């Protein structure tokens, strides 16, 4: 995280005169020479979802043509208002918008976190104005994204995290028993980030309808994969607006939508639901201020990359892309299930979590780390995951992963008490008082802003 200490001149103060552009560019391209092989060659779990040179180059030029655009001035850039409205319209359609009576509306945001915070804040504001709730509560599974905790703390919503079943899918009974007259929303993930499992969405959406509460499908990860997994012959239940009780769905264009980082979509079943997301200031000397998302000034150029990506790919592009990923996933799962010292948690389609009842998975992960792998460290239970992308569908990437894993297992199988590098860090963290995890994370964030 800090390897450019000696390599390049640091800057704690603005230089008196301006440094040449060639020089500035020379540094960035040199860091890109060190950093791009990790993602380009397929060693990172998620992080970069497309990664083709011509696709990246395509979206860079897209960015360049629209680099000055800011949606806060639709008068000046009506193209960006077109791009945003058109991204929303298309995403909505792909997530059963027609089924919901053509009332599905939404806005383009910065990321899945924004989408989840905005949905969480909307249900709060909606339930206070229409249900009278002043002490909101949200029932979500333990596997639901960390952002649910963010929204809770921020918006003063009580978050009730409910257990999972033997398949790591949400326990609807536990969800039902958690519902009180103050529950404003219940959520399910399509799929979750931890183990890549699609929660039982039809049963969650029916539960929300029965109590007259909201149902949010966090499809930030599978929004642009599951519609195409369905059409390919893979087991995927209806998870979107085709379900009567589903009131909002988030899906990330910057993830498997293959857009530049900095874009997501938040969808609501009806406009009356959407209007509660907005903030309107009527008495400010600065004029009438109306904002649909968290931010005022928005990078318009990134809405254009989301639009460009969807249009460049089309339904055929997504089917191809999804098939490649699920076949890489089929092959990867087959190999892990062929090393009986390791187990896959639940039955994921492409975000594969691997744990071990016989050995220290953290050390296994470290062995892979030494081979160049950038895997996601997981706890509760201690495991690691591989979120497969188009970067892992490239020639011999899954074969390299499988080879490196057979070796990784063997090394730990030969030295069960081995804990090198990051392995004793994950081990101390998995069983640590929350305040210790608080003091270290704080220290780590501080470590990133040092000069």
Ligand X SMILES: COc1cc(C)c(CNC[C@@H](NC(=O)c2cc(C)on2)c2ccccc2)cc1C
Q: What residues between 43 and 102 interact with ligand X by CB under 6 A?
A: 71-72, 74
Residue 290 makes contact with ligand X by CB under 6 A: yes
Q: Which of 85, 99, 359, 429 binds ligand X (CB under 6 A)?
A: 429
From the CB of 447, what's the least distance to ligand X, in Å? 9
Residue 425 makes contact with ligand X by CB under 6 A: yes
Of 106-114, 236-244, 288-296, 334-342, which part binds ligand X (CB under 6 A)? 288-296
> How is 260-284 classified by DSSP, letter by letter?
PSS-EEEEESSHHHHHTT-EEE-S-
Residue 24 makes contact with a copy of itself by CB under 8 A: yes
Question: Helix/strand/coil (H, E, C) string of 279-313?
Answer: EEECCCCCCCEEECCCCCCCCHHHHHHHHHHHHHH
Q: Which of 42, 51, 214, 245 binds a copy of itself (CB under 8 A)?
A: 51
Phi and psi of 290, rounded to 5°? -135, 120
| Positions 371 through 410 that interact with a copy of itself (CB under 8 A) | 374, 376-381
Helices 53-65 + 300-336 axis angle, to 10: 160
SS3 8: coil
From the CB of 34, what's the least distance to ligand X, in Å? 18
**Buried residues in 18-53 as b, exposed as e (16+ CB within 10 A):** eeeeeeeeeeeeeeeeeeeeebbebbbbbebbbbee
| Positions 312 through 351 that interact with a copy of itself (CB under 8 A) | 312-318
Q: What are residue 139's DSSP bridge partners?
A: 160, 186
Residue 440 makes contact with ligand X by CB under 6 A: yes
Question: How wide is the angle at C-alpha 46 spanned by C-alphas 358 and 242, nearest 5°?
Answer: 100
Residue 153 makes contact with a copy of itself by CB under 8 A: yes
Residue 282 makes contact with a copy of itself by CB under 8 A: yes
From the CB of 149, what's the least distance to a copy of itself, in Å? 5
99 binds, among a copy of itself, ligand X, none (CB under 5 to 8 A by kind): none
From the CB of 325, what's the least distance to a copy of itself, in Å? 17
> Among residues 270 and 331, whose Cβ is nearest to a copy of itself?
270
420 binds, among ligand X, a copy of itself, none (CB under 5 to 8 A by kind): none
The strand pair at 279-281 and 137-141 is best described as unpaired
From the CB of 79, what's the least distance to ligand X, in Å? 13
Task: Supply 370's token pair.
Answer: 């030494």
392 binds, among a copy of itself, ligand X, none (CB under 5 to 8 A by kind): none
CA–CA distance, 257 with 1 (Å, rounded to integer): 28
| Positions 195 through 214 that interact with a copy of itself (CB under 8 A) | 195
CA–CA distance, 190 with 222 (Å, rounded to integer): 6
88 binds, among a copy of itself, ligand X, none (CB under 5 to 8 A by kind): a copy of itself
Length of the chain: 451
Cβ contact 69:304 at 8 Å: yes
From the CB of 47, what's the least distance to ligand X, in Å? 9
Q: Which of 287, 340, 395, 433 binds ligand X (CB under 6 A)?
A: 287
Residue 392 is classified by DSSP as G
The contact set with ligand X (CB under 6 A) reads 71-72, 74, 286-291, 376, 425-426, 429, 437, 440-441, 444, 448
């Amino acid at each position: 995280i800090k390897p450019y200490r000696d390599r390049f001149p640091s800057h704690a103060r603005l230089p008196r005169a301006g440094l040449p552009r060639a020089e500035i560019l020379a540094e960035i391209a040199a860091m890109g020479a060190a950093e791009s092989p990790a993602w380009r060659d397929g060693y990172a779990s998620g992080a970069v979802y497309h990664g083709d040179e011509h696709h990246i180059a395509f979206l860079n030029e897209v960015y360049a043509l629209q680099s000055q655009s800011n949606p806060l001035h639709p008068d000046l850039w009506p193209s960006t208002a077109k791009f945003e409205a058109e991204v929303v319209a298309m995403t909505a359609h792909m997530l059963g918008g027609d089924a919901a009576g053509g009332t599905v509306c939404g806005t383009v945001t910065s990321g899945g976190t924004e989408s989840l915070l905005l949905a969480m804040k909307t249900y709060r504001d909606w339930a206070r104005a229409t249900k009278g709730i002043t002490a909101p509560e949200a029932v979500v599974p333990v596997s639901a994204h960390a952002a649910f905790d963010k929204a809770a703390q921020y918006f003063g919503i009580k978050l009730v995290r409910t257990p999972l079943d033997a398949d790591y899918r949400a326990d609807v009974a536990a969800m039902r028993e958690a519902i009180t007259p103050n529950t404003v929303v219940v959520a399910g993930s399509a799929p979750g980030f931890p183990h890549g499992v699609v929660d039982p969405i039809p049963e969650i959406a029916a539960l929300a309808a029965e109590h007259g509460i909201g149902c949010h499908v966090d499809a930030c990860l599978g929004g642009f994969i599951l519609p195409w997994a369905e059409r390919l012959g893979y087991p995927v239940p209806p998870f979107d607006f085709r379900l009567e009780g589903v009131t909002s769905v988030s899906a990330d264009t910057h993830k498997y939508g293959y857009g530049a980082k900095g874009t997501s979509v938040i969808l609501y079943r009806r406009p009356d639901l959407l209007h509660y997301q907005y903030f309107i200031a009527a008495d400010w000397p600065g004029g009438i201020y109306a904002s649909p998302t968290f931010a005022g000034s928005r990078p318009g150029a990134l809405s254009a990359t989301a639009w460009a990506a969807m249009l460049s790919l089309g339904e055929e592009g997504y089917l191809d892309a999804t098939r490649r990923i699920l076949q890489a996933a089929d092959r990867l799962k087959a190999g892990v299930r062929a090393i009986p010292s390791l187990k896959i948690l639940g039955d994921p389609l492409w975000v594969i979590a691997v744990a071990s009842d016989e050995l220290n998975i953290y050390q296994v992960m470290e062995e892979m780390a030494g081979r160049g792998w950038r895997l996601n460290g997981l706890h509760r239970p201690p495991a690691f995951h591989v979120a497969l992308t188009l970067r892992h569908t490239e020639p011999g990437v899954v074969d390299r992963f499988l080879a490196d894993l057979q070796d990784a297992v063997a090394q730990v199988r030969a030295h069960p008490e081995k804990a090198t590098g990051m392995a004793p860090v994950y081990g101390m963290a998995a069983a640590a008082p929350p305040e210790l995890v608080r003091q270290v994370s704080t220290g780590f964030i501080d470590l990133l802003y040092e000069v």
